[PDB]
Ligand binder design. Structure first.
Ligand SMILES: [Cl-]
Length: 259
């Protein structure tokens, strides 16, 4: 009850719409707030795309080493790693790391294209038992985040359950699961989001996202000191098209649900 009141007060102060799902594997419990509503995923969808490539690699051993050409025509609106490789190639492993650890949007588009497009990433989610996730578009348009638009959305409940399967469960083979966890633990974009609301000693693998309407998101697997792991999804979006990012709201939500 107190946790619910605190999340409601945070949402009201923020001026926007907040979605939270925590899974505590110590006791198989959940803390949920707007957890069945849809939110634009933005960059957080890169986890599903990278996982689809990892699954494909289980039956194709040379897959992560496969080379992909990077051209000026591939550049989109945020290309921190790919811009350094124009006119050469990157491997699928390198593209996966760039997408997950730097939010590189060219890298996301190469993962999407490799597996057959947004409908193939969605069909992979369905094969895992996630019947909520939908990836409709490529970068950069998947980030528009218009209120009421179901494109490129999922719910906090669904994304927490799927992230648990991918990182702690058996969706991927042992080598592939370990690779995903290692990539997420090395993320560089998350220190002001969920991590900022947790003790310094806790270990985190996370993926952030941001987009139109001040959309500010983070999804994480968390190893608290001497405790069973947690899965946490914090999604946030605002009423104004040009609203600024609010990573502090995600930090505040993480503190509330883990105190
Ligand atoms: Cl505005």
């Amino acid at each position: 009850a107190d946790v619910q009141q605190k999340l409601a007060e945070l949402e009201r102060q923020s001026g926007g719409r907040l979605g939270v799902a925590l899974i505590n594997t110590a006791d198989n419990s959940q803390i949920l707030y707007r957890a069945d509503e849809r939110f634009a995923m933005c960059x957080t969808s890169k986890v599903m795309a990278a996982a689809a490539v990892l699954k494909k690699s289980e039956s194709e051993p040379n897959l992560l080493n496969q080379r992909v050409e990077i051209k000026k025509s591939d550049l989109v609106n945020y290309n921190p790693i790919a811009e350094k490789h124009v006119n050469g190639t990157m491997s699928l492993a390198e593209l996966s790391a760039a997408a997950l650890q730097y939010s590189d949007n060219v890298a996301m588009n190469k993962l999407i294209a490799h597996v057959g497009g947004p409908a193939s990433v969605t069909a992979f989610a369905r094969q895992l038992g996630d019947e909520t996730f939908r990836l409709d578009r490529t970068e950069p348009t998947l980030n528009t985040a218009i209120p009421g638009d179901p494109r490129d959305t999922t719910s906090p409940r669904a994304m927490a359950q799927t992230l648990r399967n991918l990182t702690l469960g058996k969706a991927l083979g042992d080598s592939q699961r370990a690779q995903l966890v290692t990539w997420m633990k090395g993320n560089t974009t998350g220190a002001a989001s969920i991590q900022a609301g947790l003790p310094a000693s806790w270990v985190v693998g996370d993926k952030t996202g941001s987009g139109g309407y001040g959309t500010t998101n983070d999804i994480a697997v968390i190893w608290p000191k001497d405790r069973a792991p947690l899965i946490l999804v914090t999604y946030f979006t605002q009423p104004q098209p040009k609203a600024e990012s609010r990573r502090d709201v995600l930090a505040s939500a993480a503190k509330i649900v883990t105190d």
